[PDB]
mmCIF file of C-alpha atoms in Angstrom:
data_model
loop_
_atom_site.group_PDB
_atom_site.id
_atom_site.type_symbol
_atom_site.label_atom_id
_atom_site.label_comp_id
_atom_site.label_asym_id
_atom_site.label_seq_id
_atom_site.Cartn_x
_atom_site.Cartn_y
_atom_site.Cartn_z
ATOM 1 C CA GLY O 3 31.637 118.151 115.745
ATOM 2 C CA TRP O 4 31.072 117.422 112.038
ATOM 3 C CA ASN O 5 31.884 113.727 112.484
ATOM 4 C CA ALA O 6 28.720 112.778 110.606
ATOM 5 C CA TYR O 7 30.135 114.146 107.351
ATOM 6 C CA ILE O 8 33.390 112.284 107.882
ATOM 7 C CA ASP O 9 31.513 109.047 108.584
ATOM 8 C CA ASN O 10 29.498 109.573 105.392
ATOM 9 C CA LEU O 11 32.598 110.333 103.313
ATOM 10 C CA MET O 12 34.310 107.208 104.652
ATOM 11 C CA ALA O 13 31.276 104.908 104.562
ATOM 12 C CA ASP O 14 31.604 103.362 101.086
ATOM 13 C CA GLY O 15 35.169 102.269 101.822
ATOM 14 C CA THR O 16 36.788 103.845 98.768
ATOM 15 C CA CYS O 17 38.603 106.559 100.733
ATOM 16 C CA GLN O 18 41.268 106.395 103.449
ATOM 17 C CA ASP O 19 41.188 109.964 104.769
ATOM 18 C CA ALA O 20 38.675 112.796 105.061
ATOM 19 C CA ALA O 21 38.446 116.132 106.875
ATOM 20 C CA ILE O 22 36.410 119.261 107.446
ATOM 21 C CA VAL O 23 38.539 122.339 108.138
ATOM 22 C CA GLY O 24 37.372 125.867 108.939
ATOM 23 C CA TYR O 25 39.453 128.561 107.253
ATOM 24 C CA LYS O 26 37.879 131.844 108.377
ATOM 25 C CA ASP O 27 40.094 133.972 110.641
ATOM 26 C CA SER O 28 41.558 131.113 112.693
ATOM 27 C CA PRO O 29 41.926 127.929 110.592
ATOM 28 C CA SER O 30 41.313 124.659 112.465
ATOM 29 C CA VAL O 31 40.451 121.023 111.739
ATOM 30 C CA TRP O 32 36.796 120.684 112.740
ATOM 31 C CA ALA O 33 36.725 116.953 112.016
ATOM 32 C CA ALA O 34 39.002 114.327 110.489
ATOM 33 C CA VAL O 35 39.963 110.652 110.509
ATOM 34 C CA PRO O 36 42.012 109.937 113.663
ATOM 35 C CA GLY O 37 45.421 108.361 113.086
ATOM 36 C CA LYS O 38 45.558 109.450 109.452
ATOM 37 C CA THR O 39 46.942 112.546 107.732
ATOM 38 C CA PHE O 40 44.374 115.369 107.435
ATOM 39 C CA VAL O 41 43.909 115.420 111.218
ATOM 40 C CA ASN O 42 47.406 116.945 111.367
ATOM 41 C CA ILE O 43 46.658 119.832 108.986
ATOM 42 C CA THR O 44 48.014 123.132 110.325
ATOM 43 C CA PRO O 45 46.515 126.649 109.997
ATOM 44 C CA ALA O 46 49.655 127.577 108.049
ATOM 45 C CA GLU O 47 48.930 124.799 105.557
ATOM 46 C CA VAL O 48 45.358 126.061 105.240
ATOM 47 C CA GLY O 49 46.760 129.539 104.642
ATOM 48 C CA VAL O 50 48.700 128.256 101.637
ATOM 49 C CA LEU O 51 45.619 126.474 100.270
ATOM 50 C CA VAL O 52 43.465 129.606 100.389
ATOM 51 C CA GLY O 53 46.289 132.070 99.749
ATOM 52 C CA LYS O 54 46.162 134.592 96.903
ATOM 53 C CA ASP O 55 49.386 133.158 95.492
ATOM 54 C CA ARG O 56 48.554 130.242 93.206
ATOM 55 C CA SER O 57 52.021 129.932 91.677
ATOM 56 C CA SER O 58 54.497 128.686 94.301
ATOM 57 C CA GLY O 63 53.945 121.544 95.850
ATOM 58 C CA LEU O 64 52.245 121.822 99.232
ATOM 59 C CA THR O 65 51.804 119.814 102.413
ATOM 60 C CA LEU O 66 48.675 118.579 104.159
ATOM 61 C CA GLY O 67 49.399 117.480 107.709
ATOM 62 C CA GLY O 68 53.056 117.391 106.717
ATOM 63 C CA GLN O 69 52.359 115.096 103.764
ATOM 64 C CA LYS O 70 53.845 116.571 100.580
ATOM 65 C CA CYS O 71 51.418 116.818 97.661
ATOM 66 C CA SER O 72 51.433 117.876 94.010
ATOM 67 C CA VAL O 73 48.814 120.299 92.713
ATOM 68 C CA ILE O 74 47.243 118.761 89.618
ATOM 69 C CA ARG O 75 44.285 121.098 89.153
ATOM 70 C CA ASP O 76 43.706 124.346 91.039
ATOM 71 C CA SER O 77 40.313 126.039 90.897
ATOM 72 C CA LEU O 78 39.820 126.322 94.656
ATOM 73 C CA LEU O 79 39.215 130.075 94.695
ATOM 74 C CA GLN O 80 37.494 130.101 91.303
ATOM 75 C CA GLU O 83 34.415 124.455 90.819
ATOM 76 C CA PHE O 84 35.840 125.873 94.056
ATOM 77 C CA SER O 85 37.936 122.711 94.057
ATOM 78 C CA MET O 86 41.515 121.482 93.928
ATOM 79 C CA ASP O 87 42.809 118.111 92.782
ATOM 80 C CA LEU O 88 46.102 116.843 94.168
ATOM 81 C CA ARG O 89 48.257 113.742 94.318
ATOM 82 C CA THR O 90 50.388 112.706 97.285
ATOM 83 C CA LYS O 91 54.106 112.850 96.507
ATOM 84 C CA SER O 92 55.832 109.462 96.615
ATOM 85 C CA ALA O 96 55.756 104.131 96.789
ATOM 86 C CA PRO O 97 52.073 104.388 95.780
ATOM 87 C CA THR O 98 50.449 107.819 95.409
ATOM 88 C CA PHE O 99 46.851 108.792 96.173
ATOM 89 C CA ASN O 100 44.226 111.133 94.730
ATOM 90 C CA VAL O 101 43.256 114.055 96.963
ATOM 91 C CA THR O 102 40.504 116.602 96.380
ATOM 92 C CA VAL O 103 39.912 119.814 98.309
ATOM 93 C CA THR O 104 36.649 121.730 97.937
ATOM 94 C CA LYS O 105 35.907 125.144 99.427
ATOM 95 C CA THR O 106 32.604 126.124 101.032
ATOM 96 C CA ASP O 107 31.612 129.407 102.680
ATOM 97 C CA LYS O 108 33.379 128.495 105.917
ATOM 98 C CA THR O 109 35.139 125.151 105.458
ATOM 99 C CA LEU O 110 37.573 123.193 103.352
ATOM 100 C CA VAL O 111 36.428 119.647 102.662
ATOM 101 C CA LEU O 112 39.309 117.263 102.039
ATOM 102 C CA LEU O 113 39.248 113.695 100.764
ATOM 103 C CA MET O 114 41.952 111.136 100.033
ATOM 104 C CA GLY O 115 41.287 108.065 97.929
ATOM 105 C CA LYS O 116 42.704 104.620 98.485
ATOM 106 C CA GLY O 117 45.105 103.242 95.878
ATOM 107 C CA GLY O 118 43.557 102.482 92.510
ATOM 108 C CA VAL O 119 40.494 104.660 93.015
ATOM 109 C CA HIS O 120 39.614 107.195 90.291
ATOM 110 C CA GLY O 121 40.503 110.800 91.069
ATOM 111 C CA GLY O 122 37.168 111.604 89.470
ATOM 112 C CA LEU O 123 35.366 109.632 92.169
ATOM 113 C CA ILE O 124 37.299 111.378 94.945
ATOM 114 C CA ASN O 125 36.524 114.713 93.305
ATOM 115 C CA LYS O 126 32.838 113.837 92.890
ATOM 116 C CA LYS O 127 32.452 112.702 96.507
ATOM 117 C CA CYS O 128 34.252 115.809 97.786
ATOM 118 C CA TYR O 129 32.390 118.163 95.436
ATOM 119 C CA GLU O 130 28.948 116.873 96.408
ATOM 120 C CA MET O 131 29.671 116.921 100.143
ATOM 121 C CA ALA O 132 30.801 120.543 99.933
ATOM 122 C CA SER O 133 27.619 121.284 97.981
ATOM 123 C CA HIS O 134 25.619 119.659 100.771
ATOM 124 C CA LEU O 135 27.484 121.695 103.378
ATOM 125 C CA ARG O 136 26.816 124.989 101.592
ATOM 126 C CA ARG O 137 23.085 124.390 102.032
ATOM 127 C CA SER O 138 23.330 124.971 105.790
ATOM 128 C CA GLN O 139 25.991 127.684 105.779
#
């Protein structure tokens, strides 16, 4: 399920990819945008995102990214940029059970992507 939250995240047209991914015990994509990138996120990739090691970029659905700000286990958020060709702002926010991921279209503020991701995760915490 969880397609409602994807639809909402994608509705204003500023973003090109979004996903909800469970990370407890057996990580899995609960919902994502078909034919994009996040839908291909692997449990191993999730493992890196939530791993205790915050030193060692990373990949999301195979797509190489650069970590720009990491507070995921702290904001409970992470800001990234896709590694290039035009690059895109990506934000990952961590709820009690899920990772919420959001990728902006070219020329969209990383702050907007972060805000949209942050608030959605906040919304999701209210029912978890």
